Scaffold this active site. Structure first.
Site, PDB file in Angstrom:
ATOM      1  N   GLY A   1      -0.793   5.521  10.982  1.00 51.77           N
ATOM      2  CA  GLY A   1       0.475   5.393  10.984  1.00 51.77           C
ATOM      3  C   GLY A   1       1.057   4.173  11.654  1.00 51.77           C
ATOM      4  O   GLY A   1       2.278   3.812  11.161  1.00 51.77           O
TER       5      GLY A   1
ATOM      6  N   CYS B   1       0.507   0.996   9.953  1.00 51.22           N
ATOM      7  CA  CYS B   1       0.729   0.032   8.823  1.00 51.22           C
ATOM      8  C   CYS B   1       1.882  -0.197   8.643  1.00 51.22           C
ATOM      9  O   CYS B   1       2.836   0.309   8.920  1.00 51.22           O
ATOM     10  CB  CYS B   1       0.005   0.858   7.794  1.00 51.22           C
ATOM     11  SG  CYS B   1      -0.317  -0.297   6.291  1.00 51.22           S
TER      12      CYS B   1
ATOM     13  N   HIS C   1       0.880  -1.308   0.108  1.00 54.03           N
ATOM     14  CA  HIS C   1       0.069   0.110  -0.111  1.00 54.03           C
ATOM     15  C   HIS C   1       1.181   1.176  -0.038  1.00 54.03           C
ATOM     16  O   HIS C   1       0.237   2.219  -0.426  1.00 54.03           O
ATOM     17  CB  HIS C   1      -0.887  -0.027   1.303  1.00 54.03           C
ATOM     18  CG  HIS C   1      -2.217   0.930   0.900  1.00 54.03           C
ATOM     19  ND1 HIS C   1      -3.200   0.668   0.393  1.00 54.03           N
ATOM     20  CD2 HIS C   1      -2.557   1.858   1.719  1.00 54.03           C
ATOM     21  CE1 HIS C   1      -4.161   1.382   0.333  1.00 54.03           C
ATOM     22  NE2 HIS C   1      -3.746   2.451   1.148  1.00 54.03           N
TER      23      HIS C   1
END
Ligand SMILES: Cn1cnc(Cn2c(=O)nc(Nc3cc4cn(C)nc4cc3Cl)n(Cc3cc(F)c(F)cc3F)c2=O)n1
Ligand SMILES: Cn1cnc(Cn2c(=O)nc(Nc3cc4cn(C)nc4cc3Cl)n(Cc3cc(F)c(F)cc3F)c2=O)n1
Lengths: 300, 300
Positions: free
Chosen positions: A143, A145, A41
């Site tokens: 944040g 991830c 991502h």
């Protein structure tokens, strides 16, 4: 004595966490030997996040499009590749702090430790279970991830989870370290629902054994039950079917306490049918299902 | 979203843990710069443990009586001294992994992270609160003596707890890092009782705010109460008196949620008076009191 949700010491993993940035999109990566693993991502710009075509997006990038920072030191990216939903960024430096590690996929009902991280910096550590519906009830803010979940045996870190996204309802979804999602989710910024969940029966029983090892015995009773009449009551309360294999794993706890598994099941049936009556077990007023039999043995 | 008992990442502390042995008695020590800190109980032989005279015992030892092992490497002891209930062993090597650190004493009701260790080897990390009666409801087995509790702000580890002993009832007692016990306990192997405990009111309120931040709102109500009529009901349920200073600390959570502190107190009074009616808050069926306002803000 005592019984806590206990995580593995996190130092071996803290030494592997880095920040990855592509464009203005930033998240956490895992630096092992000369490779950084992170959610794919990261190659999405805001306009790509809803409906990315990742092969498209990635063919449009080169190595210099990826900024990897290990603390203060930026890592020179010398190659890149997709593996399912993880990006692999080869860098010119092998991580001098790489632990002995493995990439393992876990089963629903199993537990692991989560090191929550922000901008490559570790923030907190806590214990989580993979739910039957392949979500985890984690604690994660914007944040996070790329944060990773793991277990440790002796000196070896078994990485099992990379965090991707928060669902509506506020549970969390992610992949193993080969990039393969747990559960039926995809890495796009659309709302996706978790399927119905169930309670992990063998874990509740393990935790009842922990309670007995720790001197909570009020819920015990003289009755027994068959595997099957138990599963008939369990089914009613949205509990996972208990199998003869679950019974076999409870063996060592049954031995150490002298309480037959099917007798503890009789206690469980009465707890389900009567509630707890304002009493507690190991400081909880609910039947706890995020401790495996191994966690109980490891701590008791 | 989500809300977990979350510990600080433990790596900075894992690098300081060592094993200390005197005679056949062994426990964990903390190696910072060129000093190892450990419970003075380590100089007791089995026959000394019930009723030690530590000044006596210590004058009978020399530096070579102390074996300190840092992993595989034994640390040469070049001096020793008592400070209250901790022993200080000067060694010939400064720990190359020493973090920025401080020794701080904490207040009842405050939280910290515990790195549980055995034979100098870290085993697990979990979050604990110092109870009003100066015990902690930890998880600790034989061999955990000398494990440390700590907080981290930025890069600085604030060490606040060194584990000594398990009481009957199974709660844990220990000292700050200057060797001064929390609570009215002494480092001898005799049975000592914890005094009566109370529930940490400001923490329960903080956690109710966390619940609202996380979308649990079922327990809210339209009522309010005065500080004093609240404390009248709190007193009945073995809750700590809530003070105007506690109210002031809840300020920022009250702001972010728009719920006046004294209105949340009205919810708390009804929860105490009605129970939870088989409903849960943040996955718990009890009123949780081991999250400070800072923990809530740090995680929400
Ligand atoms: C509240 N919460 C709980 N867990 C999470 C994890 N999470 C996250 O940390 N970031 C996400 N989107 C990003 C936005 C960015 C903005 N900038 C500058 N950089 C960003 C990087 C990310 Cl990764 N998301 C959303 C999300 C992330 C995915 F990987 C995915 F496949 C779908 C998604 F919708 C997110 O859930 N946030
Ligand atoms: C079940 N449990 C929970 N927490 C604890 C902590 N704890 C401990 O780890 N060890 C202790 N006594 C020792 C015996 C030893 C035997 N050998 C070879 N070496 C030993 C070292 C110790 Cl420290 N104790 C008992 C104890 C330790 C103290 F420091 C103290 F002041 C009084 C005590 F009764 C203990 O509680 N065990």
């Amino acid at each position: 004595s005592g019984f806590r949700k206990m995580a593995f010491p996190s130092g071996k993993v803290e030494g592997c966490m880095v920040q990855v940035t592509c464009g203005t999109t930033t998240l956490n990566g895992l630096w092992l030997d000369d490779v950084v693993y992170c959610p794919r991502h990261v190659i999405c710009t805001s306009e790509d996040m809803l409906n990315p075509n990742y092969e498209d997006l990635l063919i449009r990038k080169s190595n210099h499009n990826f900024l990897v920072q290990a603390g203060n030191v930026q890592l020179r990216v010398i190659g890149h590749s997709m593996q399912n939903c993880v990006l692999k960024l080869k860098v010119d430096t092998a991580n001098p702090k790489t632990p002995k590690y493995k990439f393992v996929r876990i089963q629903p009902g199993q537990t692991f430790s989560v090191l929550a991280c922000y901008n490559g910096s570790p923030s907190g550590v806590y214990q989580c279970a993979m739910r039957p519906n392949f979500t985890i009830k984690g604690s994660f803010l914007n944040g996070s991830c790329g944060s990773v979940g793991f277990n440790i045996d002796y000196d070896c870190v078994s990485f099992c989870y990379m965090h991707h996204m928060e669902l509506p309802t506020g549970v969390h979804a992610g992949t193993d370290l080969e990039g393969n999602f747990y559960g039926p989710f995809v890495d796009r910024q659309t709302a996706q629902a978790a399927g119905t969940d169930t309670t992990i029966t063998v874990n509740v029983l393990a935790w009842l054994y922990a309670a007995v090892i720790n001197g909570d015995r009020w819920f015990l009773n003289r009755f027994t039950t068959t595997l099957n009449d138990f599963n008939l009551v369990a089914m009613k309360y949205n509990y996972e079917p208990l199998t003869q294999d679950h019974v076999d794993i409870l063996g060592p706890l049954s031995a150490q306490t002298g309480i037959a598994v099917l007798d503890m099941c009789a206690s469980l049936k009465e707890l389900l049918q009567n509630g707890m009556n304002g009493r507690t077990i190991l400081g909880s007023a609910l039947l706890e299902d995020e401790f495996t039999p191994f966690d109980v043995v490891r701590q008791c």
